[PDB]
């Protein structure tokens, strides 16, 4: 009985078109975010290779900066282009993993710059959401219109918290390789981040609360490394 001319069939075909367009847009963003996530993890793996070994430091940060810049100029530009006339919160679940992994890699590279500072690079702040937002500014090709990738402060705070798992990993790798001054550096950084995070007074913020809980265990692990270094020596602290 119901055919293509039935008002209810007409109506549901209108609803279906709206759901298809939404689903298609979600799928394109999920794919972009996946590739951002994969490349960010690769960049963090590259960053972890930095050691006393001299001719690696600057060369590694260089390649990491180039690969992070490509993600900004290509992949994040594609996501911002997709969301141009959209409510950015509607699709947050589609790009959130990529954004958080990118922020983790970006801030880890900044940490590593600060750590080997001989002079005034010690004065630099980690980039905050406004500083990262400022690198994600785009222009249509040909006057031509400006667009950006909106960086939600909550997404930033969540991404930055993952940096602390990287600090803890660097602390462990440094014990292994006998680079024990780096254990101290990463531990101080963890203590400072942890103090900043516990300063936060957030209602119903369940994801955040779990991050801080995990952060406490990273801080404790790094503090125990520095301890075993102090009491057993670099070498005997490796064996445990």
């Amino acid at each position: 009985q119901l055919d293509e001319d039935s008002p209810i069939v007409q109506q549901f075909r209108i609803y279906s078109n709206e759901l298809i367009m939404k689903h298609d847009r979600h799928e394109r963003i999920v794919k972009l975010s996946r590739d951002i996530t994969i490349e960010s993890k690769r960049i963090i793996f590259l960053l972890h290779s930095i050691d006393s070994r001299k001719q690696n430091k600057e060369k590694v940060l260089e390649e990491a900066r180039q690969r992070l810049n490509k993600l900004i100029a290509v992949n994040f530009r594609a996501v911002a282009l997709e969301l141009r006339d959209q409510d950015v919160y509607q699709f947050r679940s589609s790009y959130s993993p990529g954004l958080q992994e990118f922020i983790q890699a970006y801030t880890y590279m900044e940490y590593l710059c600060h750590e080997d500072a001989e002079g005034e690079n010690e004065t630099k702040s980690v980039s905050d959401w406004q500083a990262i937002q400022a690198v994600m500014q785009y222009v249509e090709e040909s006057s031509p219109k400006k667009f950006q990738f909106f960086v939600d402060p909550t997404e930033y705070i969540l991404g930055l918290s993952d940096l602390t798992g990287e600090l803890m990993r660097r602390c462990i790798n440094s014990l292994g390789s006998g680079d024990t001054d780096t254990c101290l550096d990463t531990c101080k950084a963890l203590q400072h981040f942890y103090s900043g995070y516990i300063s936060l007074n957030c209602q119903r913020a369940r994801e955040l609360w779990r991050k801080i809980t995990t952060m406490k265990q990273s801080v404790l692990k790094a503090e125990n490394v520095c301890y075993n270094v102090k009491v057993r020596g670099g070498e005997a602290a490796k064996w445990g």
């Binding site: 119901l2 209810i8 069939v9 109506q11 549901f12 075909r13 609803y15 279906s16 709206e18 759901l19 689903h23 006339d85 409510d87 950015v88 919160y89 509607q90 947050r92 900044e110 940490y111 600060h114 500072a117 010690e122 004065t123 630099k124 702040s125 980690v126 905050d128 402060p153 909550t154 705070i157 101080k188 950084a189 400072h192 981040f193 900043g196 995070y197 300063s199 936060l200 007074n201 957030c202 209602q203 913020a205």
Partner: protein, 225 residues
Amino acid sequence: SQDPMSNFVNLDIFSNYQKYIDNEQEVRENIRIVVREIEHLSKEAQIKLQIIHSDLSQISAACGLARKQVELCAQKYQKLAELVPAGQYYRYSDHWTFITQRLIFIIALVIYLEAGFLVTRETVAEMLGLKISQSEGFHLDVEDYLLGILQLASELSRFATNSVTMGDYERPLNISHFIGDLNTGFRLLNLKNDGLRKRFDALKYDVKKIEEVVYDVSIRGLSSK
């Protein structure tokens, strides 16, 4: 100088974030106040419509009472719209999705009971003072509309059963046709594993309950025509 790590781990970032989140919590609190006013109006419509399950002669009165409650909702939605900046609808929409689905259910139930047909998303938006398009202003999400009308089947299977108890043997067939057309519409959507598809997947059990009522009366040749 004394502490280089305090430069890197800039505590202004955390105090800025505290301010951001405080500002947001204040908006959420204001939103929640308006949503509770909406919940109160929708409950009143819902209570009046429970009469369909025990007194068939009160259906049109209950429908009129509910339309009055629904009219009051649209005024509250304007207040909600005032609290929600452009570009931030989906920042806050978890606060009103459940009550909005519920009002859609109530509106669709009223229209089914008065006239026998399925209310459109556009008519529901008009009655709530909502735009159909986010570019136009504070809008009704099509997914909220679809989730709301799915609530129809459970209520209508309850009503099919009660109708027979009360001697109205034609109602279940009418409901069966109506829920059958709704089902046809939903299958048109070709939904994939997601939240909407999960809720669509429960519709079959209400379809089945209604078909059983239709079978019981037709197999017995029962009639109140």
